[PDB]
Amino acid sequence: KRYTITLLPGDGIGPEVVSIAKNVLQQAGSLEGVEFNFREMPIGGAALDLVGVPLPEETISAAKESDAVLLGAIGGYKWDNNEKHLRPEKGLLQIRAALKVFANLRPATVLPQLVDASTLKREVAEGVDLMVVRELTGGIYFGEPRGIKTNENGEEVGFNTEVYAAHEIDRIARVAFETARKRRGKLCSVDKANVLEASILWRKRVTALASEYPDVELSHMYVDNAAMQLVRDPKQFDTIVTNNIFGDILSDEASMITGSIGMLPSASLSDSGPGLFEPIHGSAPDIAGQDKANPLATILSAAMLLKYGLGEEKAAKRIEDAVLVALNNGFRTGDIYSAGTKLVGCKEMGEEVLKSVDS
Amino acid sequence: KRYTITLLPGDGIGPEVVSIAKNVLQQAGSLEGVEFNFREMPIGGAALDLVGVPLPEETISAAKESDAVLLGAIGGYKWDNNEKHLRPEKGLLQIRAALKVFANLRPATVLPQLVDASTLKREVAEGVDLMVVRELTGGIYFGEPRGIKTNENGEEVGFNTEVYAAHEIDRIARVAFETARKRRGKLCSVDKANVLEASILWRKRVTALASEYPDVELSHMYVDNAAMQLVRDPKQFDTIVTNNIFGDILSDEASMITGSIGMLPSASLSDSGPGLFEPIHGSAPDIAGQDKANPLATILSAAMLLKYGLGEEKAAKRIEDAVLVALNNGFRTGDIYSAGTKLVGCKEMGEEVLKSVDSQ
Numbered sequence A: 001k002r003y004t005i006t007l008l009p010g011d012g013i014g015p016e017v018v019s020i021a022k023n024v025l026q027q028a029g030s031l032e033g034v035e036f037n038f039r040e041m042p043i044g045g046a047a048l049d050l051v052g053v054p055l056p057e058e059t060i061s062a063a064k065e066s067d068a069v070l071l072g073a074i075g076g077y078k079w080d081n082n083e084k085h086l087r088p089e090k091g092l093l094q095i096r097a098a099l100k101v102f103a104n105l106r107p108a109t110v111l112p113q114l115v116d117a118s119t120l121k122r123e124v125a126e127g128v129d130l131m132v133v134r135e136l137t138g139g140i141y142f143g144e145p146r147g148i149k150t151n152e153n154g155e156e157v158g159f160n161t162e163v164y165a166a167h168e169i170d171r172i173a174r175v176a177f178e179t180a181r182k183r184r185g186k187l188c189s190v191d192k193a194n195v196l197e198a199s200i201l202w203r204k205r206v207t208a209l210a211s212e213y214p215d216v217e218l219s220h221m222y223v224d225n226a227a228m229q230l231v232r233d234p235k236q237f238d239t240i241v242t243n244n245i246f247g248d249i250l251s252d253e254a255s256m257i258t259g260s261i262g263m264l265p266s267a268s269l270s271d272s273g274p275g276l277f278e279p280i281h282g283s284a285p286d287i288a289g290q291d292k293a294n295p296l297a298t299i300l301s302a303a304m305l306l307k308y309g310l311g312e313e314k315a316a317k318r319i320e321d322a323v324l325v326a327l328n329n330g331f332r333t334g335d336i337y338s339a340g341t342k343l344v345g346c347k348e349m350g351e352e353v354l355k356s357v358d359s
Numbered sequence B: 001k002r003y004t005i006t007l008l009p010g011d012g013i014g015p016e017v018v019s020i021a022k023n024v025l026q027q028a029g030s031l032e033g034v035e036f037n038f039r040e041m042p043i044g045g046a047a048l049d050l051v052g053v054p055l056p057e058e059t060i061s062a063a064k065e066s067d068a069v070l071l072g073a074i075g076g077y078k079w080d081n082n083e084k085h086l087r088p089e090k091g092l093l094q095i096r097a098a099l100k101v102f103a104n105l106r107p108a109t110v111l112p113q114l115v116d117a118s119t120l121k122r123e124v125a126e127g128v129d130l131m132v133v134r135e136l137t138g139g140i141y142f143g144e145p146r147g148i149k150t151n152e153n154g155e156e157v158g159f160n161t162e163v164y165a166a167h168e169i170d171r172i173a174r175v176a177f178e179t180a181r182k183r184r185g186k187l188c189s190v191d192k193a194n195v196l197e198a199s200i201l202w203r204k205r206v207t208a209l210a211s212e213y214p215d216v217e218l219s220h221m222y223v224d225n226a227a228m229q230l231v232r233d234p235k236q237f238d239t240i241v242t243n244n245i246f247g248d249i250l251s252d253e254a255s256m257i258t259g260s261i262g263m264l265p266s267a268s269l270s271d272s273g274p275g276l277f278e279p280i281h282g283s284a285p286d287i288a289g290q291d292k293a294n295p296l297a298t299i300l301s302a303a304m305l306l307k308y309g310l311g312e313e314k315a316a317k318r319i320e321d322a323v324l325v326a327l328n329n330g331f332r333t334g335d336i337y338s339a340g341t342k343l344v345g346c347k348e349m350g351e352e353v354l355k356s357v358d359s360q
């Protein structure tokens, strides 16, 4: 049983972390009887240096033909000064649209081993287990009209439009509901409907679907409160559904509960289409090549790649299990270092994670 | 002296916290030879229930002609179902634009007594200090075009426009830099310039003014890292400048560092015009009339009114000191209750601040 996997290493620590996950992927899948066809294609800063655009057509077709796509990270200091159309991050947004992967899943759950690693008091952060369902292919990140023009004044004005059509909200809502059922049956839609006509529609469509999902209990919370709640009593959430710009911010805030931004993986899914799996981190421009980075998040994106994109649930559990063994043995990278643990770097963790897969 | 203060008690817990602050404002100013003309006006749900709109024209004029504006909060379940034009929250937005208070100062600094009140560990949260300078009157909260239309396929499509003109960015960056130089000399601009052309201009303009303030050490951070940073190592920030919507989010997150959202005051300032002072929290529909509320944010929001809006610094320090006295005496409301303290509600906590103002 063979699968075609496209690796998009990217920039920063992207290559570093993906190489590790690729090996974890081959070994874990091999134990459950699957081999893989790996194929590196350029994206972001890498593609810019090679072909001159952040996302070449050659990459998009290569990703579509594949069964699933594993991305590292994107962006870097060298290209921070390009035109808006030639920054690397523009490649990531395009690949999300190109793959039509609207439903973005970021699960932040605190492992018992990393409780001392969080910055939250133990009682606050122990046992947290929430899942963020973020709208990925629409909204202010993809909203038209946008740009910077110069009106008659001679003043520059920058503008983007946060815009969602109803069907865009509906599809992400069901995924929230379906997911919130698979968990603890509680769902929380986060918007800013006290001000934004976009958030008015957002809540309006989400309240609609609750009748179709009575197994799921829906509640609504404003985005400013939710950021505070994720620090006051983060244990409260089961599933949170929200839009692109709030999904990005809140999920990035939630990481520091589990111990670091380097612990969180993300699965980006579509109907039919092959899924896009990446870590929410990216892309450590300041510890690039120093071999300091935490690769766990990228490994788990390979876990999620198997679980959600290819359905090899058994293999994915082996991946989770290895990360658990590795942490039980005391191995921490810099960001998840606790007193009395063992501070490894990146290769030197991936190896002895792979020790656990292989045992 | 004799200043005119407009009290906008809003909704929810608004009335009680402002009432308590009104007494503290009165006494603290009174000790320094200062009197006040208090004029109460309807805003938000109160005004909807009275005249049928969130912000009556009579309220705006009364607010304009006063020296300082003291607001509680806005919003409540009763009015959550009105047409968009008729939402209490829109009155808040309207009074800010009407008063042209673009510079929003929300300072989150962790007090020694409330370290245990935080959910961040002591080492992380002890000595935290930061000030958020938020663009208040521009941005997505005020951007046109906006509305809910229907495209030809009959689908309802909602939209807002995040838009900043160059001068909108410039003046608030100036406030940020000016704030830093009185502070610890660090400024951190937060945007999403990897995706948003609005923020690209925000970055372009803010870096530009950096040449005018060599005294201030300016750094740039994307908003998603910013959220993780306020939890990873919040001791780092000195002054943070950002736009309307990112300011809302980040300032609420930063609140929990100091113990609860009920600790944070906010001053909103304008050129020449009288400023609008509110606590950053909402109307707390869940604790309203139970006398559970934390008044400190509003008592401290009254402190900012004296210091920043009226220049009565000595009286303003009287309010600040009293909050400290009450906290040294063990008094906590529910949101800032840490073990072995004395749990009180809103009305006595307020009396215990007053108890202490009148002791010096």
Ligand SMILES: *NC(=O)c1ccc[n+]([C@@H]2O[C@H](COP(=O)([O-])OP(=O)(O)OC[C@H]3O[C@@H](n4cnc5c(N)ncnc54)[C@H](O)[C@@H]3O)[C@@H](O)[C@H]2O)c1
Pocket (backbone or CB within 6 Å): A012, A013, A072, A073, A074, A075, A076, A077, A089, A092, A261, A262, A280, A281, A282, A283, A284, A285, A286, A287, A292, A293, A294, A295, A297, A335, B194, B221, B222, B224, B225
């Ligand atoms: N969706 C993406 O792939 C993505 C999201 C956001 C930004 N980028 C691009 O990366 C660089 C830099 O962005 P930052 O503002 O620096 O945010 P991060 O790069 O993730 O840095 C956060 C801090 O945490 C550290 N960190 C990240 N990942 C880590 C791991 N695995 N181990 C240890 N430490 C990690 C970082 O060093 C930071 O200190 C920009 O160009 C942006 O466009 C891509």
Ligand SMILES: *c1cc[n+]([C@@H]2O[C@H](COP(=O)([O-])OP(=O)(O)OC[C@H]3O[C@@H](n4cnc5c(N)ncnc54)[C@H](O)[C@@H]3O)[C@@H](O)[C@H]2O)cc1C(N)=O
Pocket (backbone or CB within 6 Å): A194, A221, A222, A224, A225, B013, B072, B073, B074, B075, B076, B089, B092, B261, B262, B278, B279, B280, B281, B282, B283, B284, B285, B286, B287, B292, B293, B294, B295, B297, B335
């Ligand atoms: C800015 C934004 C929104 N509002 C309006 O206020 C209404 C309340 O909704 P919300 O629950 O989402 O925000 P809120 O701050 O009210 O709630 C915060 C949570 O924390 C508790 N809490 C708040 N404030 C206090 C205080 N002062 N003391 C103790 N506990 C507090 C609350 O129980 C709650 O759980 C909503 O309609 C929204 O429209 C208002 C503002 C503004 N400045 O007016």
Ligand SMILES: [Mg+2]
Pocket (backbone or CB within 6 Å): A248, A252, A280, A281, B224, B225
């Ligand atoms: Mg991010």
Ligand SMILES: [Mg+2]
Pocket (backbone or CB within 6 Å): A224, A225, B248, B249, B252, B280
């Ligand atoms: Mg707020």
